């Protein structure tokens with residue numbers, strides 16, 4: 102069977118799968134069509150079952166860097182803890198919402214065991230193509246279901262565990278698509294101050310009275326992003342002074358594309374905040390404050406300059422010390438900016454300004470898309486910054 | 493200035509431009525936010541003005557195949573006729589809706605004159621990068637505005653001219669993105685029967701009483717897509733019999749990717765129709781008919797087999813006659829299937845089944861995304877089929 106024929110048919114089957122899923126979600130979004138949620142959950146359950154059957158055959162036939170695998174395993178284990186909580190709820194409160202968690206837990210176990218023990222190889226190329234493309238778009242549809250459906254201890258625990266589930270499904274979908282295309286072919290002192298201020302702000306918030314806490318969160322974010330922009334810009338300036346060939350790797354290219362694709366969520370969130378801020382300021386209202394406009398423009402500019410710095414640092418006496426201290430300072434700053442959203446410091450959802458401009462559903466869906474991508478971006482940047490720091 | 497630095501900053505600026513536009517459209521979609529339509533029209537007017545300023549500088553500094561250019565010129569001239577109609581309306585019925593049509597007409601004139609007389613070149617690479625990426629995302633935002641806002645003779649003419657405007661903006665955006673990435677680097681008898689039946693069905697419909705006309709449209713489409721699937725499949729079978737190396741071009745790759753990206757609209761439309769059909773059939777209702785389910789599954793399968801055939805025909809005595817007659821038959825069938833939507837035979841919008849399942853706004857937006865892409869697909873396939881027919 103010709104290779105191109107399969108590279109094309111696999112892609113068409115996968116795209117049709119995604120568009121059928123999107124069609125069912127559109128029928129659901131209406132809320133007056135016959136299509137109800139349990140039909141979507143059943144569709145995705147069938148799409149997870151087929152993938153389990155495929156991976157089972159694959160493991161039957163197969164018998165006859167670490168940063169991305171450890172990240173996938175830890176996000177899959179958080180997703181599994183969430184599923185265990187959902188199975189416990191179902192058992193206590195007893196149809197499709199009981200059978201979904203169990204096929205989801207089996208799907209995550211099989212998918213971790215597959216990603217870990219996968220071997221690149223040759224006779225079975227159509228099988229691998231159609232199965233990886235099924236896995237990619239089943240994980241995308243699961244990401245979409247999570248983003249659309251999240252709009253005693255069973256309510257307090259999901260709040261903390263949903264971002265990692267959504268981030269797990271988009272991440273594994275990205276890695277599986279990357280695997281499809283290739284078938285058949287002083288700085289420490291500042292860093293510590295950053296970590297301490299982060300953990301403090303988080304404890305303060307989660308103990309909380311509350312408006313002062315969110316104000317403290319925004320002031321922290323603004324100061325942190327300003328000093329980060331300064332660090333990355335000084336790194337770029339030291340690069341521009343020391344004119345070097347700036348030439349030469351698939352891994353480096355994947356890293357660049359992931360680093361720039363993980364920022365779409367935060368950029369959308371920042372531009373929604375800026376649009377709401379200027380719209381409300383047009384009314385000549387007392388509500389307009391410059392700590393949300395500044396914090397959003399600094400979000401945009403900080404992740405732009407950081408992306409530029411990391412990419413220029415990967416494709417490339419006092420300059421060596423200056424780059425070491427800049428890389429360590431940004432390492433610790435990105436850790437400090439990852440700990441806040443991860444540990445429940447997500448105060449954006451209750452913002453009354455973007456809830457009144459965009460509506461509660463649109464704002465919470467934008468945040469559900471953005472905050473998981475933000476966590477991924479921050480920790481991918483931490484990995485890239487350590488890799489730069491070692492060179 | 494390093495090249496990568498610019499390839500990256502251009503992409504980040506363009507992505508931020510797109511996300512700011514999407515944020516303004518989200519603020520508009522709510523319908524209760526301060527953001528009203530004239531603010532979007534003004535944003536896009538600024539984004540067209542900046543592009544005109546860029547192209548003016550570019551033409552100042554520059555002094556010191558044909559299928560895709562003729563297609564762009566003819567779709568730009570239809571868009572210009574639409575803009576002339578809008579300027580005439582404004583003049584008769586007299587703020588932002590008057591200044592938008594005129595900057596849009598200037599933008600289309602400048603953009604045609606730019607695409608025609610563009611030269612690949614070297615000192616000014618950052619300028620070209622930032623300007624082509626501005627053009628790509630300004631054309632995308634114009635596509636989005638058209639798709640979202642279309643949801644005496646000034647009402648009858650836009651109905652016929654809007655699909656070509658939307659198709660023009662997505663097409664020119666695609667070509668400009670393709671231009672960005674490369675900076676600094678018997679069958680005739682059946683075919684005639686097809687053409688005659690098309691023109692007949694169209695005249696019948698536009699003269700119309702009406703339910704029989706839409707039924708005739710669906711029966712025509714079903715028979716035509718069945719015989720097309722048979723033709724493409726027989727071509728693929730003749731290929732599979734004659735085992736050939738099936739090896740070896742940038743143009744061929746662009747053609748394949750455009751041919752498969754133009755089908756997303758039709759596939760989404762077909763899967764929405766299938767989801768609505770099975771949802772209504774679940775109620776055990778008398779409305780369920782198999783001429784909409786069949787016509788949708790045939791849409792999906794026909795464009796899959798056609799894509800496969802064209803791609804296998806580009807990357808590659810009675811077999812030669814059989815392939816000539818198959819290519820000519822599909823040439824004329826795709827012309828017959830392009831003439832119906834182009835000349836006003838668009839009966840999908842008034843479908844009560846997908847209007848009740850998905851809602852009128854979601855269905856009309858899905859059709860506004862799909863029917864322009866469908867026209868592009870059909871005529872791109874006609875071009876590819878003639879190119880195959882000559883070899």
Ligand SMILES: CC(C)CCC[C@@H](C)[C@H]1CC[C@H]2[C@@H]3CC=C4C[C@@H](OC(=O)CCC(=O)O)CC[C@]4(C)[C@H]3CC[C@]12C
Pocket residue numbers: 123126127130131241245249851853854
């Ligand atoms: C591989 C690439 C495309 C990245 C993955 C992203 C997609 C999976 C996204 C892109 C656009 C998304 C769609 C865009 C908007 C909608 C409409 C939304 O419903 C409404 O807006 C309801 C409208 C109403 O209020 O009536 C439901 C989700 C859906 C289908 C989204 C589902 C997920 C999609 C396909």
Ligand SMILES: CC(C)CCC[C@@H](C)[C@H]1CC[C@H]2[C@@H]3CC=C4C[C@@H](OC(=O)CCC(=O)O)CC[C@]4(C)[C@H]3CC[C@]12C
Pocket residue numbers: 130271362365366369462463466467470518
């Ligand atoms: C994952 C990477 C590769 C791409 C991310 C691109 C995002 C900018 C896209 C993808 C999904 C999109 C969302 C898909 C669906 C929705 C829900 C939609 O609102 C509803 O569905 C509510 C309807 C109602 O309340 O009646 C508003 C737009 C939004 C947030 C979309 C905004 C644009 C998003 C976030």
Ligand SMILES: CC(C)CCC[C@@H](C)[C@H]1CC[C@H]2[C@@H]3CC=C4C[C@@H](OC(=O)CCC(=O)O)CC[C@]4(C)[C@H]3CC[C@]12C
Pocket residue numbers: 460462463514517518521522632636640
């Ligand atoms: C370069 C690639 C991404 C192709 C180009 C496609 C994008 C320009 C599309 C993909 C998803 C689209 C968005 C997905 C859904 C929405 C939500 C829609 O508003 C609602 O659904 C309102 C929700 C409600 O009812 O409350 C307005 C358009 C918007 C922002 C879309 C704008 C155009 C987007 C960004």
Ligand SMILES: CC(C)CCC[C@@H](C)[C@H]1CC[C@H]2[C@@H]3CC=C4C[C@@H](OC(=O)CCC(=O)O)CC[C@]4(C)[C@H]3CC[C@]12C
Pocket residue numbers: 127521662753756757760853854857858861
């Ligand atoms: C152009 C190529 C490269 C990609 C095409 C992908 C499409 C499948 C995406 C892009 C734009 C998306 C649309 C963007 C916005 C909308 C409008 C949205 O409905 C509303 O905004 C209505 C809100 C209301 O009525 O309150 C429903 C989903 C839909 C049609 C989205 C469905 C998925 C679409 C067609």
Ligand SMILES: CC(C)CCC[C@@H](C)[C@H]1CC[C@H]2[C@@H]3CC=C4C[C@@H](O)CC[C@]4(C)[C@H]3CC[C@]12C
Pocket residue numbers: 175178179182253254257258261262
């Ligand atoms: C080892 C790696 C993967 C980290 C694991 C973190 C685990 C231990 C975390 C993640 C989410 C957490 C839960 C989130 C919230 C609640 C609800 C509260 O009323 C009791 C504690 C409980 C139930 C937490 C227990 C600890 C928990 C399960």
Ligand SMILES: CC(C)CCC[C@@H](C)[C@H]1CC[C@H]2[C@@H]3CC=C4C[C@@H](O)CC[C@]4(C)[C@H]3CC[C@]12C
Pocket residue numbers: 357358359361362365499500503507510
């Ligand atoms: C609604 C969302 C999806 C809008 C954004 C879609 C498009 C414009 C985005 C999505 C991801 C983006 C890519 C992500 C990363 C890279 C690698 C970088 O070295 C050059 C730019 C490039 C190649 C980007 C180009 C623009 C891009 C393709």
Ligand SMILES: CC(C)CCC[C@@H](C)[C@H]1CC[C@H]2[C@@H]3CC=C4C[C@@H](O)CC[C@]4(C)[C@H]3CC[C@]12C
Pocket residue numbers: 175261307443444445
């Ligand atoms: C691997 C990483 C990402 C795991 C992160 C797990 C985080 C979210 C977990 C670890 C310990 C957890 C806390 C443990 C106990 C409590 C006390 C309880 O009364 C409220 C929830 C709260 C405050 C939990 C919140 C979530 C928490 C901070």
Ligand SMILES: CC(C)CCC[C@@H](C)[C@H]1CC[C@H]2[C@@H]3CC=C4C[C@@H](O)CC[C@]4(C)[C@H]3CC[C@]12C
Pocket residue numbers: 566569570573644645648649652653
């Ligand atoms: C030369 C190429 C680009 C094709 C051009 C086609 C032109 C001539 C077509 C496209 C749309 C057409 C218009 C669409 C509908 C109407 C409204 C009707 O009440 C009078 C005729 C009028 C005003 C048409 C005149 C002819 C028209 C302008």
Ligand SMILES: CC(C)CCC[C@@H](C)[C@H]1CC[C@H]2[C@@H]3CC=C4C[C@@H](O)CC[C@]4(C)[C@H]3CC[C@]12C
Pocket residue numbers: 108109112116119748749750752753756
């Ligand atoms: C809502 C819409 C955008 C969903 C679809 C998005 C993704 C999955 C689609 C959009 C366009 C698609 C590409 C279009 C064309 C080609 C060239 C072909 O030789 C291999 C598949 C490939 C490379 C497709 C892969 C899947 C793809 C990237």
Ligand SMILES: CC(C)CCC[C@@H](C)[C@H]1CC[C@H]2[C@@H]3CC=C4C[C@@H](O)CC[C@]4(C)[C@H]3CC[C@]12C
Pocket residue numbers: 566652698834835836
């Ligand atoms: C280059 C190609 C795509 C141009 C296509 C232009 C098409 C849409 C134009 C050409 C001539 C036009 C027709 C000319 C005259 C009339 C009679 C009028 O009472 C109703 C509109 C109607 C029936 C027009 C409909 C649109 C039309 C068919």
Ligand SMILES: C=C(C)COc1ccccc1NC(=O)c1[nH]cnc1C
Pocket residue numbers: 168169171172173175176477480481484
């Ligand atoms: C030991 C570890 C790296 C795990 O730390 C985590 C804990 C929870 C969630 C995610 C991650 N890690 C990541 O996401 C990561 N690391 C590098 N690249 C990515 C994408």
Ligand SMILES: C=C(C)COc1ccccc1NC(=O)c1[nH]cnc1C
Pocket residue numbers: 237241271272274275278279355358359362363
């Ligand atoms: C991190 C993300 C937002 C994931 O985005 C995706 C979503 C669905 C499918 C694929 C991808 N990512 C990619 O394909 C990619 N990223 C880098 N290099 C490639 C080839």
Ligand SMILES: C=C(C)COc1ccccc1NC(=O)c1[nH]cnc1C
Pocket residue numbers: 559560562563564566567868871872875
């Ligand atoms: C002489 C012509 C080709 C023009 O015919 C048209 C008329 C109206 C609208 C579009 C087109 N042509 C196309 O769209 C085309 N041709 C090849 N590739 C594409 C994308």
Ligand SMILES: C=C(C)COc1ccccc1NC(=O)c1[nH]cnc1C
Pocket residue numbers: 628632662663665666669670746749750753754
């Ligand atoms: C025909 C379309 C649906 C256009 O889709 C787009 C929309 C916005 C920007 C770019 C593209 N198309 C591409 O980038 C493309 N198509 C083929 N090869 C490339 C490199």
